[PDB]
Amino acid sequence: AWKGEVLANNEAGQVTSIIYNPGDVITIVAAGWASYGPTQKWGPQGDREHPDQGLICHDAFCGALVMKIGNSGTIPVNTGLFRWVAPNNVQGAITLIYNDVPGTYGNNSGSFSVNIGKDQS
Amino acid sequence: AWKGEVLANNEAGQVTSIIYNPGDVITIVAAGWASYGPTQKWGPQGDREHPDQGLICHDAFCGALVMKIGNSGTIPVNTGLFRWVAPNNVQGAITLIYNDVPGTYGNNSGSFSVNIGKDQS
Amino acid sequence: AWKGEVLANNEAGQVTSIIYNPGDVITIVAAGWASYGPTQKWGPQGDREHPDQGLICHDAFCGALVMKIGNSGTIPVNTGLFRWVAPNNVQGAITLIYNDVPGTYGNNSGSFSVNIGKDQS
Amino acid sequence: AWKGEVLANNEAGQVTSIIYNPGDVITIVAAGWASYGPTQKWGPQGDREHPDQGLICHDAFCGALVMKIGNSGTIPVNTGLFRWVAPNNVQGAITLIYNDVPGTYGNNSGSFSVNIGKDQS
Numbered sequence: 001a002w003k004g005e006v007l008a009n010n011e012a013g014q015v016t017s018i019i020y021n022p023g024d025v026i027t028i029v030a031a032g033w034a035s036y037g038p039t040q041k042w043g044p045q046g047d048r049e050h051p052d053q054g055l056i057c058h059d060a061f062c063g064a065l066v067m068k069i070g071n072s073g074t075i076p077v078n079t080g081l082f083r084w085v086a087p088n089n090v091q092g093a094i095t096l097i098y099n100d101v102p103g104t105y106g107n108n109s110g111s112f113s114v115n116i117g118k119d120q121s
Numbered sequence: 122a123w124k125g126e127v128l129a130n131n132e133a134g135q136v137t138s139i140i141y142n143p144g145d146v147i148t149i150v151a152a153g154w155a156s157y158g159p160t161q162k163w164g165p166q167g168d169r170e171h172p173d174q175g176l177i178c179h180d181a182f183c184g185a186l187v188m189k190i191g192n193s194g195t196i197p198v199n200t201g202l203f204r205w206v207a208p209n210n211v212q213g214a215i216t217l218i219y220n221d222v223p224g225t226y227g228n229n230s231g232s233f234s235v236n237i238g239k240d241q242s
Numbered sequence: 243a244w245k246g247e248v249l250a251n252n253e254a255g256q257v258t259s260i261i262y263n264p265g266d267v268i269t270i271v272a273a274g275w276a277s278y279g280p281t282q283k284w285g286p287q288g289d290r291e292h293p294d295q296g297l298i299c300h301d302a303f304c305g306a307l308v309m310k311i312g313n314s315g316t317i318p319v320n321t322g323l324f325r326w327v328a329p330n331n332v333q334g335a336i337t338l339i340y341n342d343v344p345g346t347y348g349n350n351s352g353s354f355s356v357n358i359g360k361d362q363s
Numbered sequence: 364a365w366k367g368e369v370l371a372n373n374e375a376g377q378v379t380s381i382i383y384n385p386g387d388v389i390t391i392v393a394a395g396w397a398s399y400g401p402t403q404k405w406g407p408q409g410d411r412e413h414p415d416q417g418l419i420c421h422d423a424f425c426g427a428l429v430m431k432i433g434n435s436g437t438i439p440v441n442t443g444l445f446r447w448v449a450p451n452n453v454q455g456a457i458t459l460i461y462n463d464v465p466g467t468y469g470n471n472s473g474s475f476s477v478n479i480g481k482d483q484s
């Protein structure tokens with residue numbers, strides 16, 4: 001299992017120690033408060049009122065937690081995943097990333113605390 | 122396992138199929154959007170800007186997800202619990218509840234989607 | 243044989259210890275009172291006056307008891323099954339489920355008590 | 364081996380001449396263009412931007428190729444499966460099916476061309 005923090009201001013995101021292999025069932029729980037710029041902060045689902053101005057993940061709100069598995073496209077995580085299995089041909093290290101527009105992470109603040117484990121299967 | 126929704130306006134909470142027993146390890150993942158009154162909505166961590174005006178759980182924000190185990194006091198759940206073990210002598214059915222002031226649930230809106238399961242132990 | 247309860251509010255239903263195998267003859271008796279939202283309660287046949295708005299089982303009323311056998315589609319149970327044999331090929335654990343529209347189980351209440359046994363064949 | 368077409372508007376799916384037996388290793392390759400309604404068409408992975416509105420297979424995109432083996436639950440095929448073995452207790456005739464919402468196949472168009480063979484073991 002892996003536990004760590006993902007910084008909102010890190011465009012590169014956080015590479016975890018989890019390698020997702022074919023058939024793996026995983027659980028993720030994410031918590032905390034972060035911002036893509038404003039003084040206010042949002043949880044791991046991000047800001048439901050904010051427009052998509054070129055987010056790294058178009059399937060989640062700005063300020064949401066997302067991930068990549070290997071070099072996959074971004075996949076929404078939000079508050080977490082419950083006994084979840086990845087699509088065909090998706091595999092590799094899990095990287096966690098704050099959802100913002102490339103080049104604009106500099107004014108971000110806060111972080112999410114995240115646990116990831118593999119489940120019985 | 123239990124999968125369902127917890128209505129923000131449900132003052133009595135949602136009694137699940139999970140009977141928490143000593144030694145049990147559980148995982149909860151919660152998602153979605155709800156309100157204690159305003160037209161805005163907040164995630165399962167609730168509204169971090171809101172004052173505590175007599176909440177059922179003083180250890181979580183207004184609008185957060187909390188729980189009771191049997192007749193325990195309220196325990197914060199927020200976005201979820203990752204392979205969590207209860208305090209000594211805590212046991213019984215898990216009831217999920219939206220965190221608001223008793224007598225004020227009637228104007229609430231929305232719900233959280235929640236999964237709970239028992240983990241290997 | 244198996245005896246237990248299934249909650250109206252549980253989208254995941256109740257996984258029983260009964261494994262239905264090809265050729266098996268089974269009997270189920272279900273009883274009790276539950277609701278898909280209204281203050282009134284209905285028995286295991288559900289509410290014959292209610293429209294189907296996207297139920298997990300289109301072959302039974304909203305509020306009815308249904309089941310899956312392994313990864314099958316939903317199968318109506320209602321008040322029960324008398325010395326019943328499945329449609330060809332179906333096999334695996336019996337999961338009992340309350341018939342409602344996915345995502346709308348939040349306002350459900352009550353439960354059904356259910357007995358299942360294998361018969362001679 | 365088997366080669367044939369799967370029509371997007373065929374809700375029942377195409378039953379192939381392949382009987383999957385315990386221990387079998389199979390390869391599937393699928394190609395072509397189909398739609399679940401729009402004038403555009405998508406390949407066998409379907410439309411990655413489309414919401415799941417009650418698909419017969421929740422583990423693939425709308426417009427993806429999926430299959431059943433015997434009476435199994437749906438299994439994603441997408442572009443194909445390379446030297447693949449089925450889950451425990453899955454066996455029987457392979458039926459190929461376009462992934463759409465039940466009752467909504469009538470406005471579908473196009474087809475996938477599919478090859479299936481058994482591999483050495």
Ligand SMILES: Cn1cc(O[C@@H]2O[C@H](CO)[C@H](O)[C@H](O)[C@H]2O)c2ccccc21
Pocket residue numbers: 036037038051052053062100101104105107
């Ligand atoms: C429309 N709009 C943008 C914004 O803050 C910026 O959001 C972009 C991403 O959409 C980026 O993260 C920038 O670094 C942010 O400054 C807003 C704040 C308040 C209201 C409307 C906003």
Ligand SMILES: Cn1cc(O[C@@H]2O[C@H](CO)[C@H](O)[C@H](O)[C@H]2O)c2ccccc21
Pocket residue numbers: 157158159172173174183221222225226228
């Ligand atoms: C201070 N304040 C309260 C409120 O809405 C009420 O919140 C209480 C709980 O604190 C209760 O749920 C009531 O039902 C709500 O009406 C506010 C809304 C906007 C700004 C300040 C508020």
Ligand SMILES: Cn1cc(O[C@@H]2O[C@H](CO)[C@H](O)[C@H](O)[C@H]2O)c2ccccc21
Pocket residue numbers: 278279280292293294295304342343346347349
């Ligand atoms: C039309 N209609 C629906 C309803 O209750 C809702 O029913 C759906 C399922 O169809 C779902 O369970 C909801 O959670 C229920 O609130 C009604 C009640 C009274 C009259 C008409 C209704």
Ligand SMILES: Cn1cc(O[C@@H]2O[C@H](CO)[C@H](O)[C@H](O)[C@H]2O)c2ccccc21
Pocket residue numbers: 399400401414415416425463464467468470
């Ligand atoms: C949201 N949405 C649906 C759609 O076409 C329908 O898709 C459903 C399946 O989700 C079904 O196959 C229907 O027969 C289709 O008409 C859309 C087309 C364009 C944009 C958004 C759509």
Ligand SMILES: [Ca+2]
Pocket residue numbers: 035036037100101104105106107108
């Ligand atoms: Ca920013």
Ligand SMILES: [Ca+2]
Pocket residue numbers: 156157158221222225226227228229
């Ligand atoms: Ca309120």
Ligand SMILES: [Ca+2]
Pocket residue numbers: 277278279342346347348349350
């Ligand atoms: Ca309901």
Ligand SMILES: [Ca+2]
Pocket residue numbers: 398399400463464467468469470471
């Ligand atoms: Ca269609």
